[PDB]
Amino acid sequence: AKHLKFIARTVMVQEGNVESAYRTLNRILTMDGLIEDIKHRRYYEKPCRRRQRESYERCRRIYNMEMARKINFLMRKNRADPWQGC
Amino acid sequence: WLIKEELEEMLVEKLSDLDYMQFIRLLEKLLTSQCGAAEEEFVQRFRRSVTLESKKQLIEPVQYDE
């Protein structure tokens, strides 16, 4: 309200490509967490429920990052069989 | 290639399906190489003469009347 306008969340259109400008803006708001924050703010999440989800999300990220690391590590040996026939 | 039941008789043993495949995959890997005469008599022991009787039609003889 008290800030300058046309600086925050503002994307310029290139060569009249408004679809790409809108997608860029949508990607910015998504990465910064705004799109998902507006949605969660439509109805009140009860504090006990917010902690449960924030803890589930935190643990799914740790589990997915750890499962990706394991697959990458064990994919080094995906090469062809060096001792075929034995 | 010889069938699994024909390999199971050359060897006189019972074989799995995957056992048969591994042996065939190993023979194919041997043809792609520069196999010599000694390595060619061996592979032919496991190549059967497929009943490739041609689909070519048999022609009747041309006869002559009186």
A84: closest chain B residue by CA:
B26
Q: Give the side-chain half-sphere CA count within 13 A for A32.
A: 10
Chain A residues with CB under 8 Å of B22 CB are: 85
3-state SS assignment for residue A36: helix
H or E segment to which residue A22 belongs: helix A18-31
| Min Cα–Cα distance to chain A from B26, Å | 6
Distance (Å, whole) CA B3 – CA B20: 9
| Residues 6 or more apart in contact with residue B33 via CB below 8 angstroms | B39
Distance (Å, whole) CA B40 – CA B35: 6
Chain A stretch 55-84, residues whose beta carbon is closer than 8 A to a beta carbon of chain B: 84
Chain A within 8 Å of B33 (Cβ-Cβ)? no
Distance (Å, whole) CA B6 – CA B47: 10
Resolution of the determined structure in angstroms stands at: 3.3
DSSP-derived letter for residue A46 is P
Distance (Å, whole) CA A50 – CA A23: 29
Nearest CA to B22 out of A24, A18, A85 is that of A85
Distance (Å, whole) CA B32 – CA B2: 18
